[PDB]
Design a protein around this ligand. Structure first.
Ligand SMILES: CN(C)C(=O)N(C)[C@@H]1CCS(=O)(=O)C1
Ligand SMILES: CN(C)C(=O)N(C)[C@@H]1CCS(=O)(=O)C1
Lengths: 306, 306
């Protein structure tokens, strides 16, 4: 027992990180097979970032202008192409450490691991959720761009995120591995609006199930509710509306604990209206929304990768 | 910017995890050079765990009774010895993935990464602190024993923890890699007392510096204090006493932010006396104590490993 914000083991992704340099800009790339994927803004000067014409900037770049380094080894670039907001650099060597992998576009509320990197070297790993406003709350400094987010399914790495930028508010935006931004964001040094950061209701309920499994039971109340009643309260507190699809996904946790999903919703409703009165749940003083129902099952049942 | 509970990249340690089986008990071992390290309680039946005589139990075990599996490969055990609460199994093959490494015994308040494993396979990675009562608050299920805690210094892995057990209160106890428990705990299924879990004051102050660096400034107050005044308040709230050694360690953070350590102590004193009034700091509703001053510098300056 115990319940922790747990990332996937990072080794499979560590073996894919390289350094990409174009002129005076260095960031991270992802080397899979004989392609290196990186943020197209590698081609930009700080001046360019104000109003970049990526097509025009790219015309001045040749294969030999992209410096790709895998630890000590230089990779030879034999082709380059722009796909949305990423560059695909074709190299003459397939990554010998390439894992089984997929490119997936995740939905808001879904979680993933970030391997934060600088100059193609890993600094750390942490768990993130795609926020309902399509931002993530990460830890990224200058040079971290091209760091990736991923999930592992036994032996297959599903890459879902590449880091591209920080909003003036200090939240993070990026793309899938086809170079399409999550949300309405663009790779330009312009003021960009994050909308309302709503709480991922289904994830809060999953974590309340985790709390019960782990003996943290004080918040269980005598009440039930309905989806419409709960949602009328969820709306007021900027919680995502809970759907029958969400109830269905929580079924296995409901079954393990013997607590009906709607009873757990009534507990959550009282926690929203009354707060925690200075108490904690799994060591948090607020309602945690970065565990999915799949995350809770996974952690509470000890599923393995290799 | 942003500030996250960040583990070390896990790849170097993933390459060291193996499965150890003795009779009907399976747990994890750590394969470094031609030695596999594991919890000595691998030799125990659930009956044995009530009052084990490890010396007597060990007499009935031969090299061929320890089944060691590295993914698909069986390792051949050519020797075994008990060191405190760990077994050292000598194998005929040096781990080809052995990193540069050290065995270190950490102090309470120090942080490390855990790679949670089952049957020699990694499930996840998270950051822990050695609590002042020498427990850790982990995420460990049946089979996780022999999972290790570690720090990385560029290319060298410092192993500091091996998981051995859960207290009836759901906190975790284990050893250094010489098999000496942290704290007064024993590898026996007996009721064992965790003492007071005090807050790591120096770590709270480091995280308050991280908050300021990351623009979360609302808690900065107009006051200062002294070490004796602050400590009189720290004691009442079960905070560890702050020493001049602690002030010294916070010097670089004090220098970066221009906030005197004692001014930050006066801010912390008001947060203890008055609480957060429903506000957050780096997305927490409580004062976080599992970042060291070294952790904050490291994360805020993007230091790299390989
Ligand atoms: C592309 N990179 C690396 C960035 O972080 N940006 C340009 C931010 C966009 C919004 S901003 O102008 O505040 C900075
Ligand atoms: C050795 N292992 C794997 C354990 O977790 N224990 C025996 C705990 C000691 C205290 S207990 O008796 O509650 C269980």
């Amino acid at each position: 027992s115990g319940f922790r914000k747990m990332a996937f083991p990072s080794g499979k992704v560590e073996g894919c990180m390289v350094q990409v340099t174009c002129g005076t800009t260095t960031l991270n790339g992802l080397w899979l097979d004989d392609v290196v994927y990186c943020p197209r803004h590698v081609i930009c000067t700080s001046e360019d970032m104000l109003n970049p014409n990526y097509e025009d900037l790219l015309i001045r770049k040749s294969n030999h202008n992209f410096l790709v380094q895998a630890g000590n080894v230089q990779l030879r670039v034999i082709g380059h192409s722009m796909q949305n907001c990423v560059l695909k650099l074709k190299v003459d060597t397939a990554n010998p450490k390439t894992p089984k992998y997929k490119f997936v576009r995740i939905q808001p509320g879904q979680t993933f691991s970030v391997l934060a990197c600088y100059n193609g070297s890993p600094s750390g790993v942490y768990q993130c959720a795609m926020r309902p406003n399509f931002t993530i709350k990460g830890s990224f400094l200058n040079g971290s761009c091209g760091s990736v987010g991923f999930n592992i399914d036994y032996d297959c790495v599903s890459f879902c995120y590449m880091h591209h930028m920080e909003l003036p508010t200090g939240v993070h935006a990026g793309t899938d591995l086809e170079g399409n931004f999550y949300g309405p964001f663009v790779d330009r040094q312009t003021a960009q609006a994050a909308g309302t950061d709503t709480t991922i209701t289904v994830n809060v309920l999953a974590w309340l199930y985790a709390a019960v499994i782990n003996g943290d039971r004080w918040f269980l109340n005598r009440f039930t509710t309905t989806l419409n009643d709960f949602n009328l309260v969820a709306m007021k507190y900027n919680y995502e509306p809970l759907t029958q699809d969400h109830v269905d996904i929580l079924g296995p946790l409901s079954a393990q604990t013997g607590i009906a999903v709607l009873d757990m919703c009534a507990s959550l409703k009282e926690l929203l209206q009354n707060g925690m009165n200075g108490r904690t749940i799994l060591g948090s003083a607020l309602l945690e929304d970065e565990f999915t129902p799949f995350d809770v099952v996974r952690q509470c049942s000890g599923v393995t990768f290799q």
